């Protein structure tokens, strides 16, 4: 009956303008909005009004509902006297120190509970203060401070029931403003184990999304603030980044947004990201700036793009400070496909300063020749998400100077692996790149050419060697740098001849005849290699007669992105 | 006739393996152990069930049964 | 180095100079022949690779007066 | 320190006596302490050597007692002043100088040495940490490899324990280590698997002195291995994994008090089994099942109804075995939001297979007999399951078995009243128990309790039908004398299963 009859008085109002308010008028004792109020306050007061099912479940929308359009009445100047009849906000103040927050006792909570659930509902109801005397300042004591007691008193232990109970009083803290910059001051507390860190562990959540409404405000604000605390600023900020990352359902734009902020204030905090904060500090904002950038905006912020080059070259700074970690230095070198000559200088640098020559230099257990292989690793793996051209040429001078250094396989494989992968045109450029550097010998033609050469796409295949077709014509014709370079052209137009099939055909295959039935190994090499490319080129020529006698994964990607981790 | 290649190539572990032989033994015996307590498990099961009619579908009972399949059951 | 610490273990340029500050006893090889090691960082196929070995030749003068070399 | 010469003598006055000795030195490594001190040298170099050898037995005597003798050792130079001597002489020498279980003996060498670098240089505490969260790192990414992940796991606990100002960068890295590790948990031998749960443990151990680090990294981990194991598909009408294998882990993790006092020797349950169950609500409040027909089912996310089920499996096998005693606080709440979700989606056996273990776990401990949260629990209860007893009646098996297993699995006192629903489902149990034992095995459990706790008076009208339907279930009716010291039978006993004749 009361839900039905409340149903009625929403019709009433809503469907029935003003015009009809007299009719709304004919109530005229408005006892049955008193004891709709004292369901709002305690649901059993219609009785047990219990049974914790849909119905009740209902009841607090369509309760919100019908006190808004109460509020849109006239009648809710009725409304706000018999809701300020019944409390004005200040029962909380002594049901604050009621020896709560603990099993201590559960019908105070329960009560704080319910009270708490009727504030909110009157929150949402657009209720604010017509409840609430309005506190001169923009802070609302009657909910920060209770906050602030328990949540400092309690833990010198907590409930499960005690953490929904403080995760609204969060909520209520959150219903009124100014009390932002009040938690900014609180979490930014030194004051074993912070106690404003203590709190961001508590509610992490709650705080995030309330700080999602200062979207740039309280970022600047503690960003400043953090000159002289590191680690809680940095937290915090990562905090951010993860529910962005998890703020995508609605849309990403606003992490898109957050970035964008803190990158036009980037350089309010600059006691980082050089040789002025500890190499953890460094390492820390070393996350925080990748999470960014796998968060921000990718089609910008990559090349010159405003506020681009603040971070950019503070990130190239990081590639250019000597004194970080080699792990460290691998970890920004992950970072590189997020993205000019300097680029290729601090790589030169580096590549030089930590394996010169070799990495059979350095015997394998020994620490440094482990975070050795763990650095091009990383390099391997980002070069193969990036696929550019530069770093590939790179990390091949890298590897084309001795067999097998750097366990030559991962580096073959991510070639395959890329290979397959990128635009046809895009692997043909890493394909004429890795050629002209050709042009010992040997190792940059066999470690990196034919490795692509095989596992490229056929339409890459046909620009790239319609590129060569006569400039392998001409060339096939220090003898020993002279035989290595027609080496490398006989692996490359074997298989290339074996794969597709112009009518230039006869002249190769008499110049690989002549070539292979010629009458120091340099010779028995090049025997064999144009006897490779006369097989091949007689597989398409002559070959037909004889031989010329889930909701979960996310949760885990986001997991592991807010890890940083594969 | 033919697996004479097989043998061949089989006994191509004549590099000392025989210790990596036992290593190999002893590691498909715990997967056996495995396999048997699975076995166990399925064998406490009541056996699957046999019956002794054939049967030929259609939009009506086909009465062409045999006497074999009458009193088999 | 032997307990509550120790160093990193389980040589063209920087490897060498590593090996010769090891030379604080009996001063003797990774100086002789370990500058092989500097000529092979010499086979200028890049710039930072010569000009890095001959830095290194130019620190192994001083390195190895230094260690009665 | 006479018998401790003799003991010495025993390993080398120049077949398997001297492993008999390490056997008694490893169980009284602490008795003799003070005077093993000295001659530590020959004493690792002869266990090192003895650890090496055929009679595997002797192996693994060597083992145990070289890291019993090198916790004692550890424990001493601990309380040193002259702690110099030991720590640096041998330990990180030979350690390094090491580089199968030859690597984890050196591991868990850097772990115990861990313990005077917090007396002296502090520094180097972190420092050995650091340098040991690289080398896993490289020891993660490479691709047996599995065979050493516990002994690091030990060493860090170890360092961390002696650890108080830890580099937070390398936290996330370190539990996702954990958590792959976890899920490597398989492809494992049982006495190393015994060897990683330890370890796991252990780094639980060294992880709870760091309070809200502590809270976060655990949820985190648990979080990141449930969706790990609930994501392992199973089959619908190298080797792969299945969820099915880790239950005992864990069975044995929130179960591993017995070992993780001797680990605080040289409360943890509940905060394993509180994260486990809130991590566990959590993900069942994000789940995304929704279905449709294209009754006819058609699920929007097949992944997530497996891993659904999946999950609701693997607690199922995990949660009755420990205490609802722990459990206690969730079972007014917990069961409540599964109920709003059933409500939500009536169509899912896995609610009602929830709603039976709480329930079973509810009676385990009498959650209620005959406060606030007692009564509206009860009432709860008692609204909810009328609501499901008439509503069975539009249900099919292989989804109503599972209710009417809910329903039967009720305690006698919300039963008490309105036996007019229970018995339809009680018959239409016992008569699918021809075909399903184990729904006929828990209903007639079901029965037992009624006839105890319910005045037999009000089953009177009844009794004249159930019996009937119980006419069912009764229509029908190596190894040689040579003493092997029968390791069959020394090998187990198989684990149960249900028949008919019981």
């Given at each position: 009956v009361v839900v039905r009859i409340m149903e009625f008085t929403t019709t009433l109002l809503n469907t029935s303008p003003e015009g009809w308010k007299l009719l709304?008028?004919?109530?005229?004792?408005?006892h049955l909005m008193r004891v709709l109020v004292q369901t709002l306050c305690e649901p059993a007061s219609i009785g047990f009004n219990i049974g914790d099912v849909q119905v009740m479940a209902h009841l607090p929308d369509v309760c919100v509902n019908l006190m808004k359009a109460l509020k849109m009445s006239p009648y809710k100047d009725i409304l706000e006297t018999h809701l300020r009849e019944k409390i004005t906000a200040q029962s909380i103040e002594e049901?604050?120190?009621?020896?709560?927050?603990?099993?201590?006792?559960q019908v105070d909570r329960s009560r704080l509970a319910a009270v708490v659930s009727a504030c909110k509902q009157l929150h949402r109801a657009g209720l604010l203060h017509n409840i609430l005397p309005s506190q001169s300042t923009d802070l609302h004591h009657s909910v920060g401070t209770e906050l602030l007691s328990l949540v400092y008193k309690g833990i010198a232990s907590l409930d499960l029931s005690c953490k929904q109970l403080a995760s609204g009083l969060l909520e209520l803290a959150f219903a009124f403003g100014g009390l932002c910059e009040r938690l900014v001051s609180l979490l930014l507390n030194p004051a074993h184990f912070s106690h404003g860190e203590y709190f961001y562990s508590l509610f992490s959540e709650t705080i995030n999304t309330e700080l999602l409404k200062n979207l740039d405000l309280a970022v600047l604000e503690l960003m400043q603030s953090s000159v002289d605390n590191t680690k809680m600023v940095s937290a915090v900020l990562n905090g951010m980044l993860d529910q962005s990352f998890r703020?995508?359902?609605?849309?990403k734009h606003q992490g898109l947004k957050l970035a964008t902020t803190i990158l036009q204030h980037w350089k309010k905090c600059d006691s980082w990201w050089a040789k002025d904060s500890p190499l953890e500090t460094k390492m820390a904002v070393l996350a925080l700036l990748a999470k960014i950038l796998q968060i921000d905006s990718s089609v910008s912020f990559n090349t010159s793009h405003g506020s681009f080059p603040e971070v950019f070259t503070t990130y190239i700074s990081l590639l250019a400070d000597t004194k970080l970690d080699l792990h460290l230095k691998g970890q920004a070198v992950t970072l590189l496909p997020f993205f000019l000559e300097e680029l290729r200088r601090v790589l030169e640098q580096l590549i030089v300063a930590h394996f010169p020559m070799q990495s059979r230099e350095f015997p394998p257990g020994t620490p440094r020749f482990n975070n050795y292989v763990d650095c091009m690793k990383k390099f391997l793996d980002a070069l193969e998400l990036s696929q550019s051209p530069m770093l590939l040429e790179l990390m091949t001078e890298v590897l084309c100077r001795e067999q097998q250094h750097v366990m030559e396989e991962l580096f073959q494989s991510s070639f395959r692996r890329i290979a397959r992968r990128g635009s046809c045109v895009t692997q043909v450029g890493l394909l004429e790149s890795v050629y002209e550097m050709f042009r010992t010998r040997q190792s940059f033609v066999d470690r990196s050419l034919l490795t692509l050469l095989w596992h490229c796409s056929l339409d890459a295949l046909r620009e790239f060697f319609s590129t060569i077709v006569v400039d392998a014509i001409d060339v096939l014709k220090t003898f020993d740098t002279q035989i290595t370079k027609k080496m490398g052209y006989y692996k490359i137009l074997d298989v290339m001849y074996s794969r597709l099939p112009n009518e230039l055909t006869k002249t190769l295959i008499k110049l690989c005849y002549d070539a292979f039935t010629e009458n120091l190994e340099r010779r028995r090499l090049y025997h064999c290699a144009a006897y490779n490319c006369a097989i091949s080129v007689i597989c398409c020529v002559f070959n037909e007669l004889?031989?010329?006698?889930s909701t979960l994964s996310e949760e885990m990607s986001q997991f592991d992105f807010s890890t940083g981790v594969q | 006739g033919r697996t004479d290649l097989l043998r061949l190539r089989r006994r191509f572990m004549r590099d000392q393996e025989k210790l990596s032989l036992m290593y190999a033994r002893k590691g498909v015996a715990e997967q056996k152990r495995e396999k048997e307590i699975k076995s166990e498990l399925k064998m406490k099961q009541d056996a699957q069930v046999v019956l002794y009619r054939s049967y030929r579908h259609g939009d009506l009972p086909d009465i062409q049964i045999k006497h074999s399949s009458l009193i088999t059951p | 180095q032997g307990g509550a610490h120790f160093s990193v273990s389980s040589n063209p340029a920087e490897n060498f100079r590593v090996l010769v500050k090891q030379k604080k006893a009996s001063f003797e090889e990774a100086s002789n022949q370990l500058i092989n090691h500097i000529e092979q960082f010499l086979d200028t196929n890049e710039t930072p690779y010569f000009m890095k070995s001959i830095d290194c030749i130019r620190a192994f003068r001083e390195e190895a007066i230094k260690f009665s070399e | 320190t006479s018998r401790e010469i003799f003991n010495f003598v025993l390993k080398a006055i120049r077949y398997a006596v001297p492993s008999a000795g390490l056997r008694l030195f490893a169980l009284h490594a602490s008795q003799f302490s003070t005077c093993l001190l000295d001659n530590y040298v020959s004493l690792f170099e002869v266990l090192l050597k003895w650890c090496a050898h055929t009679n595997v037995e002797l192996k693994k005597a060597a083992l145990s007692a070289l890291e019993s003798f090198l916790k004692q050792v550890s424990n001493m130079v601990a309380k040193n002043a002259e702690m110099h001597k030991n720590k640096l002489q041998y330990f990180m020498e030979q350690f390094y100088g090491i580089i199968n279980k030859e690597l984890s003996i050196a591991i868990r060498g850097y772990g115990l040495f861990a313990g005077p670098c917090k007396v002296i240089n502090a520094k180097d505490v972190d420092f050995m940490y650091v340098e040991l969260i690289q080398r896993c790192k490289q020891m993660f990414?490479?691709?047996?490899?599995?065979?050493?992940m516990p002994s690091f796991l030990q060493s860090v606990a170890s360092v961390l324990l002696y650890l108080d100002t830890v580099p937070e960068v390398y936290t996330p890295v370190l539990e996702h280590l954990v958590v792959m590790q976890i899920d490597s948990f398989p492809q494992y031998s049982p006495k190393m698997q015994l060897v990683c749960c330890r370890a796991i443990v252990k780094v639980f151990l060294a992880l709870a002195a760091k309070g809200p680090v502590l809270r976060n990294c655990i949820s985190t981990v648990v979080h990141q291995g449930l969706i790990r194991i609930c994501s392992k598909p199973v089959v619908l009408p190298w080797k792969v994994p299945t969820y099915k294998d880790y239950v005992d882990l864990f069975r044995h993790l929130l179960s591993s008090d017995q070992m993780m006092d001797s680990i605080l020797a040289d409360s943890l349950n509940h905060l394993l089994y509180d994260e486990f169950v809130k991590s566990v609500l959590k993900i069942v409040e994000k789940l995304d099942l929704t279905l449709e027909i294209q009754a006819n089912l058609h699920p929007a996310k097949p992944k997530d109804f497996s891993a659904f089920i999946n999950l609701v499996e693997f607690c199922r096998e995990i949660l009755?075995?420990?205490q609802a005693e722990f459990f206690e606080p969730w079972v007014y709440s917990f069961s409540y939001e599964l109920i709003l979700q059933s409500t939500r989606l009536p169509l899912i056996s896995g609610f009602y297979k929830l709603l039976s273990i709480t329930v079973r776990n509810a009676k385990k401990i009498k959650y209620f007999e005959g406060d606030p949260e007692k009564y509206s629990c009860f009432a709860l209860f008692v609204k909810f399951g009328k609501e499901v007893a008439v509503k069975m009646k539009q249900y099919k098996d292989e989804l109503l078995a599972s209710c009417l297993t809910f329903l039967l699995s009720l305690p006698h006192n919300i039963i008490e009243l309105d036996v007019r629903a229970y018995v339809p489902a009680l018959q239409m149990a016992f008569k699918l128990g021809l075909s399903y034992t184990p729904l006929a095995e828990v209903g007639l459990n079901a029965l037992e309790e009624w006839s105890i706790y319910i005045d037999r008076h009000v089953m009177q009208p009844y009794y004249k039908d159930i019996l009937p339907c119980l006419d069912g279930y009764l229509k029908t009716s190596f190894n040689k004398v040579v003493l092997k010291h029968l390791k069959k039978t020394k090998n187990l006993s198989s684990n149960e299963a249900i028949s008919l004749e019981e």
């Open positions: 709304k008028k004919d109530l005229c004792n408005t049901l604050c120190a009621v020896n709560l927050y603990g099993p201590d006792a703020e995508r359902a609605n849309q004889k031989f010329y006698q | - | - | 990414l490479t691709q047996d490899r599995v065979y050493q009755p075995e420990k």
